[PDB]
Design a protein around this nucleic acid. Structure first.
Ligand SMILES: [Mn+2]
Ligand SMILES: [Mn+2]
Lengths: 612, 161
RNA sequence: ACUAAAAU
């Protein structure tokens, strides 16, 4: 009687793909108790012996952390005791999917478990929740033989999956502890501060009766970024600067506008001196004729952050709307996983096949055919985070199929994919240096020689401008007029969604799957408003909250604190510290901060008294 | 001890007064020309020296400045960058020096990059002008050829932040 | 009715 090996994946699609690859096409499908996760059975060999294989799915986190008992009711608790007094338990996530019962009825007699879960911290946490759900119901492992395995993989290619199955390992318990510590920290701090603020403000100001004033280790800095930008806008004093432009003529027809090397003179008298020192001259000489070949460099692979940035900038989508559209595309099978964190293609990827699947679309059929004929250019080397393969098209589509926003996102994704395997845009930049009196001027222009990926991303295109005249050193030209232009320093504008996403990526605030959620949350809590151009304008609520936080304890808003706490969490993820020690040493610090905040709330009170 | 010392100061470039020269530490039978200069680089020209620039440099009538002179820097501002970011890569550096002989203030503008005067140069630093120096409107053109920084600290605070 | 992340 052969044994059974139970394999678990983070997604039904991932489980189906892995089971198909490892089955060599011999797969049997059944539907489980939940109705979404499926069970795939196939015969094979695991440890030098015949054995059945039962591959199944877990839809994300099995369990979610929450307070147990009365402490989940706001009217019968003091938020101050949410820190070191309220017990916390992992109850469930999506209880309509009886995931614990499904795992128990699937692993009733399984002798081995192989965790084909995502290779990240959240993946390891679900590994251990699957383990403490299935290990009680597995058959006893007599002897020293190991009964738990983990598979490390990045791509869903045949040979990658096969070799990952060949070389198996053991789960890391410290990473699960790191995730659990992060969850406890976030839950306790956020729920304590939000409960206090909501119960306080709703009791004094009537205009916030139905509002939810929420504080969090990831949305408060997000609001702080926009509030800081608004502060810069409101505290900007324009300055007046003068620029000299000289217009020369060469071929009796073309007039060249010459730019000043000593640009942006900020003193009227100095600018007038330069004008009086130049305009009395009717001849300009040529000194430098630089004709240098350069190349505009092709894009990397598409990660979720870049996709959200481009969707917010050019496609006119919100981050959450873009995430929903990408998820719909992925479920329908047109796009790869849209929550990827990697800009590097796998070393073993069917780039040629993916391009060949796009060889019958009128927008880029010619470009794809020429690229396949001349051979693809190797994609740029990027960063391999070991999370997921980058967002790539997987099936052909047309406006008649998707329609609207889904079609636009698919078009951008496939154009980016064609561009990342195309040639660089080679352009010659010609600069001519002129001497007028004792002062210098320069004229620069660009002429394309090989459009490259410009053919498939027309918008990353070098502008078409007339080539600079062929004048060598010592040639004299007549200058029509030299004029001084008065200009003012424009004020910066409110943060765009792309810039906010860039700032969140830079400062470590949020993740690949939480940036749209955080932006939508700060928009929905009426902290910021989305104006024209996807600009985030802070509201009076956001301004008063962030300014009062600065007055009381700015360390609750500063972006660096999330990174510092993450560093102390990796301290125990690497085993160099203790889970309980770090948990307590952060909780007590934040408890002292919360008590100081409660004792010093008069700052925000008097700051909000004027504006409600 | 007086006339020959004044001749030495004139040859060096300084055009102080007799009271200022005797104010610069000149211990009898001790030091003649080096230590007086050494302390002059560290003492206020406004309180020590005599006028030698023309009457109306800023007016515009003056077209050239002749003779090797020495002046005191009072303020240095980057006129190619805004006040909020006094240092920036948007425009080439261009410093609007304010210079004094102790009686009359004048303004100097830098054409060529001068790796001897920066925004970190302390006020009171002495600049020696050599040869003919052009003035265009009210501004003295300064380059690497006609300017030499002689250093010096005149006991001035930070005057910043 | 919170905080943060995984999932369709
Ligand atoms: Mn995952
Ligand atoms: Mn991630």
């Amino acid at each position: 009687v052969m044994k059974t090996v139970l394999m678990v994946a983070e997604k039904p699609s991932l489980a189906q793909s892995i089971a198909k690859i490892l089955s060599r096409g011999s797969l049997s499908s059944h539907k489980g108790l939940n109705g979404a996760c499926s069970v795939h059975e196939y015969t094979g060999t695991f440890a030098g012996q015949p054995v059945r294989f039962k591959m199944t799915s877990v839809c994300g986190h099995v369990m979610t952390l929450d307070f147990l008992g009365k402490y989940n009711k706001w009217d019968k608790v003091d938020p101050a005791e949410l820190f070191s007094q309220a017990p916390t338990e992992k109850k469930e996530a999506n209880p309509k999917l009886n995931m614990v019962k499904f795992l128990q009825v699937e692993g009733r007699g399984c002798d081995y478990i192989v965790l084909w879960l995502d290779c990240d911290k959240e993946g390891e946490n679900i590994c251990f929740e699957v383990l403490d759900a299935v290990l009680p119901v597995m058959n006893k492992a007599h002897g020293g033989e190991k009964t738990v395995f983990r598979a490390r993989f990045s791509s869903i290619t045949d040979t990658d999956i096969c070799n990952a199955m060949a070389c198996l390992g053991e789960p890391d318990h410290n990473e699960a502890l790191s995730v659990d510590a992060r969850q406890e920290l976030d839950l306790r701090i956020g729920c304590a501060f939000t409960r206090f603020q909501t119960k306080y403000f709703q009791g004094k100001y009537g205009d916030l009766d139905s509002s939810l004033i929420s504080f969090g280790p990831c949305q408060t800095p997000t609001l702080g970024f926009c509030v800081e930008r608004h502060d810069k806008i409101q505290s900007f004093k324009p300055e007046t600067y003068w620029v000299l432009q000289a217009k020369v003529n060469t071929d009796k027809d073309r007039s060249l506008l010459l730019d000043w090397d000593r640009v942006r003179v900020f003193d009227r008298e100095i600018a007038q001196m330069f004008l009086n020192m130049t305009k009395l001259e009717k001849e300009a000489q040529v000194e430098a004729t630089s004709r240098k070949e350069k190349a505009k460099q092709r894009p990397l692979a598409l990660n979720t952050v870049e996709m959200l940035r481009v969707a917010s900038s050019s496609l006119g989508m919100g981050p959450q709307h873009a995430m929903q559209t990408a998820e719909r595309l992925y479920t329908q099978g047109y796009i790869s996983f849209p929550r990827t964190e990697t800009t590097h293609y796998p070393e073993n990827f069917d780039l040629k096949g993916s391009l060949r699947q796009q060889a019958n679309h009128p927008y880029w059929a010619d470009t794809v055919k020429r690229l396949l004929a001349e051979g693809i250019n190797r994609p740029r080397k990027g960063h391999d985070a070991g999370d997921h393969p980058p967002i790539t098209p997987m099936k052909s589509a047309t406006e008649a199929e998707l329609g609207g926003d889904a079609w636009r996102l698919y078009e951008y994704i496939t154009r980016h994919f064609i561009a990342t395997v195309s040639h660089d845009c080679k352009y010659l930049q010609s600069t001519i240096s002129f001497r007028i009196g004792p002062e210098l001027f320069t004229c620069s222009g660009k002429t394309v020689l090989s459009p490259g990926f410009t053919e498939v991303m027309p918008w990353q295109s070098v502008p078409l401008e007339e080539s600079l005249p062929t004048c060598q050193r010592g040639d004299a030209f007549p200058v029509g007029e030299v004029k001084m232009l008065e200009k003012q320093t424009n004020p910066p504008d409110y943060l765009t969604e792309a810039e906010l996403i860039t700032l969140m990526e830079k400062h470590g605030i949020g993740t690949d799957a939480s940036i749209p959620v955080h932006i939508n949350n700060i928009c929905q809590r009426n902290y910021v408003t989305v104006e024209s151009g996807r600009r985030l304008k802070p509201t009076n609520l956001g301004i008063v909250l962030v300014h009062g936080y600065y007055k009381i304890d700015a360390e609750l808003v500063l972006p660096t604190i999330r990174s510092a706490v993450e560093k102390q969490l990796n301290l125990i993820a690497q085993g160099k510290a203790d889970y309980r020690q770090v948990l307590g040493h952060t909780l007590d610090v934040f408890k002292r901060k919360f008590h100081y905040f409660v004792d010093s709330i008069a700052g925000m009170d008097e700051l909000m008294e004027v504006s409600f | 001890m007086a006339q020959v010392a004044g001749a030495a100061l004139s040859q060096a470039g300084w055009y102080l007064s007799d009271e200022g020269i005797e104010a610069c530490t000149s211990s009898p039978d001790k030091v003649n020309v080096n230590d007086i200069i050494l302390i002059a680089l560290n003492t206020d020209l406004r309180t020590i020296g005599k006028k030698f620039l023309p009457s109306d440099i800023n007016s515009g009538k003056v077209e050239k400045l002749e003779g090797p002179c020495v002046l005191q820097i009072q303020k240095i501002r980057n006129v190619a960058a805004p006040k909020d970011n006094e240092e920036s890569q948007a425009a080439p550096r261009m410093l609007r020096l304010q210079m004094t002989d102790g009686h009359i203030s004048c303004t100097a503008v830098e054409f060529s990059y001068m790796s001897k005067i920066s925004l970190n140069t302390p006020p009171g630093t002495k600049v020696k002008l050599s040869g003919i120096v052009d003035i265009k409107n009210g501004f003295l053109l300064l380059n690497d050829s006609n300017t030499t920084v002689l250093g010096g600290e005149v006991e001035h605070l930070i005057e910043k932040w």
